[PDB]
Every structure is written in C-alpha cells, then in structure tokens.
Design a protein around this nucleic acid. Structure first.
Ligand SMILES: [Ca+2]
Ligand SMILES: [Ca+2]
Length: 460
RNA sequence: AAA
C-alpha cells in the first residue's frame, strides 16, 4: 500500500477535493478551453493540468496524458527551458494517472521525481511540496471549479500573503476570490466591500493585469465611485491582453451605468471568441431586458407598431440567451430565474411556472438565492395566477430564510400589502388578521401585532 | 454570472 499512501501526499488535482459534479462538467471543460485560448497569464501549467483532470473524469485517460505532456512542453518552451517547482503538480498528476491506468512502474517513477525535488529544496515532507507557487496553484484550481470552493481558494492565497504581503500572484488570487465572495453577499443587509482594498493592492502589484482592473472598476461602481471605476475600465480596454474577459466585465459596467447599447456591442464581440460562455449569454439577456424596460417607459406601457415589434424582439432575444445559458449550465440558478421572469413578459405562464418549479428543487451555493426564488414565485402566484393562497405560502417561505436582505424586506412588504387587501374585502378574516399580526411583529410593532393576534383569537 |  506504499504507492497509494504516497500518492495521497502529493499536492495536485487528485488530492485537492475539487468535487467536480457531472452536471457542471461540460461547462467547466468549455471554460477551461476558453481560458487556455484567451486568458493571458504568465504560467499556463495549472490550466492544462485542470484540463487533464477533467479528461480523466470524463473517462478519457489517454487524452488526459496529452494535456499533461502539453503542460510540460509549454513550461519549457515559454520560460527558457528553466526548471520550475510548478512542474511538481504535473508530475503528481502523472503519478495518479499512471496509477489509475495500471502503469504502476511509471507511477513510481513520477513519485521518485517529486521526492527528488522535495529533498533538493530541503522540504520537510517527502512528497508534499510546501511553497507559495503550489499554494497559488491550489487556489487557482479551486477558483475555477465553482462557488462552493471559493472560501478554500481564498484561504490558499491568504496563506501566501501572510508570509509575503507583496506577492503579486497571490494578491491577485486573493482579490478575485474575495470579490466573488463579496458578490454572494451583495444583497444582504449591511454587506461590506471586503474585496476593495485587496483589489487596489492587486492592481498595484500586477499593473499589466486587465482582469483585476475590471473587477476593481466594478467594485468601485458598487460603492458609488463609478467615475473612478471607469478610469480602470478604459485602462483595461487599451491593452490587448485577455481582451475577451475584459469585454465581459466592461460590458457589465456599462450596462449598470446605463450605456446598454455600448454593453451589447462589447458582448457581441466577446461572443465571437467564446460562444459557449454562460456568463456572456446571461449578460446579453440582461441587456435585452434593460432595453425592454426602456421601451416600456418611453411608451408608458402601450407600445404599438414598430415599438411593439422592437419590444417583442427584446423579449424573444432575452429568452433565447437565458435558455442558452441554462442549456449549457443547468445549475445556473439565477439564469433560470431571469428566464422564468421573461416568460411572464412573453405571456407564457406555463413556461414561467415550469422554470419556477425547477428552481424550487435547487440547492444553491448561495442560500439566500432561495429568498428571491420564493419571492418572485409568490408575485407570479399573486399577479399572474390570481392565487393568494399560493402567494402567501411563498412569501412566507422567503421570510422563513432569516438572513436580512433586500428581498426579505420586499417579501414582508408584499405579504402586508396582500393581507391588507384581503381585509378590505372581509374585515373579519381570521387568517388574515393573524398574518397581519405576524407582519407587524416582524417589523417590530409589538402592540399592533398583539392587537391583531388577539382580535384573531376572539373570533375563534 | 440576476439582485
Ligand atoms: Ca492573448
Ligand atoms: Ca493542445
């Protein structure tokens, strides 16, 4: 059992517990291929090792070995054939691959290669290489493999910064991880911009990195400093590196600023290069949604003639792109929610309902998203299905998720409005009286609350 | 990646 025990001491994708789910694997593979072709980074060893790991999980071990050989080839060709500790991730993945393929003599050869380097560098462990480069590699792998891994990713980069606070690579990874984690909390009450200072430091330490700049721009826009942010958008757009990724986030920036036509032009250029990106399809749908809202206001809700044709084009285009996003990544919860809401605009309540039913079964990484799912389904029930019974059920389910948020407050207000309406048509509805007491209790008005709870009690 |  020495071989398997030794393999478990290696630091590589096989021991990083990435937990890649089958239903997210097609999208992951597409994003890995996009990154190989279009993200300009100093080292590409990590991304080719992740592609090999994906190929292995797909049952394509010979294809996996080709990616590991490419990782080794690129490491030398583009860095003066110098030795680099990042090779140990590749060798570790070779050892695991050969073990799984039954090429056990070769697996042992790769264990021996790793051991030889750990000894040469006075590493305390025989096989587990302790160095900042491999902490970074672990972090980048976690960061590519879905939101459930982001706290672990951030901690990988933080471990480096606790020893070397000006390390450029880990500054970048820590800032991106922190930014995405801030996004998970962006609608929660009293959320704070933990990623802002990290992003400023990462831009300082990585002055040519346009990916970091556009995230800094977006966080500045979040914090009410759009003009400052726009300077970073312009700097990133002036450099050719990673252009297709810069376009995604610049487009978000311009959409949120109100320059939707400009956003769409950038996204359509980006789609020429990465047509499988679910982020691009979702962002494109969001632009069409924003244009729909614009047309509705200019025509005060009653577009006719060419305006009606334009509106229908926006609705059907948003549906097309939201459907494209969820075909490619069926776990993309918020894209299903935007899709359901757009089927309401199209007048197809059966397809809206179908997508809401799908959403009610999901288990998002961000648990608060289920507040939005119940809230919007409750609104659909109240306003499209004319079912106060089901509206109340789902407003209550949103409220039961206790985390204070924009949506939980809207759900309380919507429930209040609904029950006040029912009491106007029937002042002695006992269920409505106690729900109104509940609402007032959640708001803090304890005397009004107990009044309605008592009033409700008497009648019974 | 909605918000
Ligand atoms: Ca390039
Ligand atoms: Ca290749």
């Amino acid at each position: 059992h020495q071989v398997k025990d030794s393999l478990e001491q290696l630091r590589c994708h096989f021991t990083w517990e990435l937990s890649i789910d089958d239903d997210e694997m097609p999208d992951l593979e597409n994003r890995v291929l996009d990154q190989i072709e279009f993200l300009d980074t100093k080292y590409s060893v990590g991304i080719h090792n992740l592609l090999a790991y994906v190929k292995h999980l797909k049952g394509q071990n010979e294809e996996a070995l080709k990616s590991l050989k490419e990782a080794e080839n690129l490491m030398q060709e583009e860095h003066d054939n110098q030795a680099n500790v990042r090779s140990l991730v590749t060798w570790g993945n070779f050892a695991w691959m050969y073990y799984h393929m039954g090429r056990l003599a070769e697996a042992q050869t790769y264990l021996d290669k790793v051991e030889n380097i750990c000894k040469k560098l006075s590493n305390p462990f025989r096989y587990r290489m302790e160095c900042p480069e491999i902490d970074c590699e672990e972090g980048w792998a976690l960061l590519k493999c879905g939101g459930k891994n982001y706290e672990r990713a951030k901690a990988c980069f933080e471990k480096v910064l606790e020893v070397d606070p000006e390390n450029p690579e880990s500054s970048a990874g820590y800032a991106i991880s922190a930014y995405r984690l801030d996004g998970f909390k962006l609608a929660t009450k009293n959320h704070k911009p933990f990623s802002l200072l990290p992003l400023r430091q990462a831009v300082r330490l990585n002055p040519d990195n346009g990916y970091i700049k556009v995230l800094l721009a977006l966080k500045l826009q979040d914090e009410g400093q759009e003009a400052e942010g726009e300077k970073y958008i312009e700097e990133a757009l002036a450099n050719m590196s990673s252009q297709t990724y810069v376009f995604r986030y610049a487009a978000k920036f311009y959409r949120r600023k109100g320059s939707v036509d400009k956003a769409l032009e950038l996204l359509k250029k980006a789609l020429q290069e990465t047509p499988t990106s679910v982020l691009l399809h979702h962002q494109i749908g969001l632009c069409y949604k924003a244009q729909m809202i614009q047309i509705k206001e200019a025509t005060k809700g009653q577009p006719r003639g060419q305006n009606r044709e334009k509106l229908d084009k926006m609705i059907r285009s948003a549906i097309f792109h939201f459907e494209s996003a969820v075909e490619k990544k069926p776990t993309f919860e918020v894209a299903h929610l935007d899709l359901a809401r757009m089927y309401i605009e199209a007048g197809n309540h059966r397809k809206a309902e179908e997508n809401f039913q799908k959403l009610l079964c999901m288990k998002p990484v961000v648990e608060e998203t289920m507040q939005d799912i119940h809230f919007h389904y409750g609104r659909f029930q109240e306003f499209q299905k004319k079912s106060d019974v089901n509206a109340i059920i789902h407003y209550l389910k949103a409220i039961k998720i206790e985390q204070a948020s924009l949506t939980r407050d809207k759900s309380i207000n919507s429930l209040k409005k609904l029950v006040l309406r029912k009491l106007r048509r029937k002042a002695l509805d006992l269920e409505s009286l106690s729900l109104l007491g509940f609402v007032y209790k959640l708001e803090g008005n304890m005397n009004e609350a107990e009044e309605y709870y008592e009033r409700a009690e008497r009648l019974a």
